[PDB]
Design a protein around this nucleic acid. Structure first.
Ligand SMILES: [Ca+2]
Ligand SMILES: [Mg+2]
Ligand SMILES: [Mg+2]
Length: 430
DNA sequence: ATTATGACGCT
DNA sequence: AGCGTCATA
């Protein structure tokens, strides 16, 4: 009873940009705004591969991981923006730079953890305490939460979407006890007020819209964010978890979308997150290991302790290119030319990074894939990165992989290379 | 022939 | 260290 932790100690948000690369291209080119449109990389092979899709285009069934030629079958009027190509490869700089715009705005409100190119976690616990004291026990107006959904509401004793949202928000606010500054539900609500402000700032200052989730930890905040996309935010309270989880497929929770999640389902013979509550912590630890078992035991009750790391910048800077099918690199000079191309982009990004961020990478990781290997990486070797020079880095890369060449002829490369990867790691302050 | 990334876990 | 897992545009 009184000693059972409820995982309600923090307020955590997850902010995720809507259709992000598409919004970046729509800002740049007003002709793409309010249209079915997608972002594609390359073109020759089946029209190029789609990697982002506007909500208008999703209505036609267009998805990412779709070839443009196939997308055009579903949506003949689909508009397409191409990823830039430099040095023979896709270059994602425009989107990385747009990401920095958003991340810097978020950082004004709180410490953030960059979780991907288009999303960050926010620990709002301290900010909420401060807003609560300014507030002085004053009720929170629905007007302060104009894009917020309360998951699970309305409920109990109109047929339009915005009407339903307000109904649920009214029920939530009607029940709140604004008298208690330590009330977790109140804390989440104030968190949601701050995230409205954050999201308004992002849209004002960049033109980009986003969604967000507000909860007590990262996993629930992430889950919440997706419940009402696009351009909306969702509050998932501790109390909402039993109903939410009672029909939530296990694979929907972050980290369970792969083999572990499949094993939870198979071994325990369950389907939904809530079904996990019936197992003891030791039972879960016995199947999934000590760490996973404890994590699952807490997570299925809405509890998770993973901190929001104070890290706004990526820890690694990498450059990679596939050489599929027939385009696989079969000559040494091919290999050396592409290592140089990758190394030149890497040097460019590294030099910019050193100037912007006062740090230097000290380790170069070189990775290749070989034709036939199911595995995405076949081989990964590290060497010292002592100087930001593309020719040195590419020469060094060649040295660490040169022995991979099975071919008795040194001019020939066998088996042909289907991937090259250069990655700068182990930063030190500079 | 999705591709180009990027974080964290295991041993 | 090198490999694997999981994730996101
Ligand atoms: Ca997104
Ligand atoms: Mg995202
Ligand atoms: Mg996505």
């Amino acid at each position: 009873g009184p000693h059972m932790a409820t995982g309600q100690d923090r307020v955590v948000a997850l902010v995720d940009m809507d259709c992000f690369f598409v919004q970046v291209e729509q800002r740049q080119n007003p002709h793409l705004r309010n249209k079915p449109c997608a972002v594609v990389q390359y073109k020759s092979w089946k029209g190029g591969g789609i990697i982002a899709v506007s909500y208008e285009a999703r209505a036609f069934g267009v998805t990412a991981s779709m070839w443009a030629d196939d997308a055009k079958k579903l949506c003949p009027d689909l508009l397409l923006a191409q990823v830039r190509e430099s040095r023979g490869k896709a270059n994602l700089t425009k989107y990385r730079e747009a990401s920095v715009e958003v991340m810097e705005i978020m950082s004004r409100f709180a410490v953030i953890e960059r979780a991907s190119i288009d999303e960050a976690y926010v620990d709002l616990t301290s900010a909420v305490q401060e807003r609560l004291q300014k507030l002085q026990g004053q009720p929170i107006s629905a007007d302060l939460l104009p894009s917020t959904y309360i998951e699970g509401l309305p409920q109990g004793p109109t047929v339009q979407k915005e009407g339903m949202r307000k109904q649920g928000l009214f029920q939530w606010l009607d029940s709140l006890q604004i008298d208690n500054l330590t009330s977790p539900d109140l804390q989440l609500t104030v968190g949601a007020v701050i995230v409205e402000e954050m999201r308004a700032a992002i849209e004002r200052e960049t033109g980009f819209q986003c969604s967000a989730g507000i909860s007590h930890n990262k996993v629930l905040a992430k889950l919440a964010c997706g419940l009402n996309k696009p351009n909306r935010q969702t509050l998932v309270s501790h109390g909402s978890v039993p109903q939410l989880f009672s029909q939530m497929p296990i694979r929907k929770i972050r980290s369970l979308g792969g083999k572990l999640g499949a094993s939870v389902i198979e071994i325990l013979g369950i389907e939904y997150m809530g079904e996990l509550t019936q197992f003891t912590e030791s039972q879960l630890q016995s199947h999934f290991g000590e760490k996973n078992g404890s994590w699952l035991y807490a997570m299925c009750r809405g509890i998770e302790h993973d901190p929001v790391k104070p890290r706004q910048l990526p820890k690694t800077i990498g450059c990679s290119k596939n050489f599929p099918g027939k385009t696989a690199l079969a000559t040494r000079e091919q290999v050396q030319w592409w290592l140089l191309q990758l190394a030149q982009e890497l040097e460019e990004r590294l030099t910019k990074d050193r100037n912007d961020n006062d740090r230097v990478a000290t380790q170069l990781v070189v990775s290749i894939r070989v034709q036939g290997d199911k595995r995405l990486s076949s081989l990964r070797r590290c060497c010292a990165l002592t100087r930001y020079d593309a020719h040195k880095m590419s020469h060094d890369a060649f040295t660490v992989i040169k022995n991979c060449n099975t071919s008795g002829i040194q001019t020939e490369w066998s088996p042909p290379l289907t991937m090259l990867f250069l990655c700068a790691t182990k930063f030190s302050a500079s």
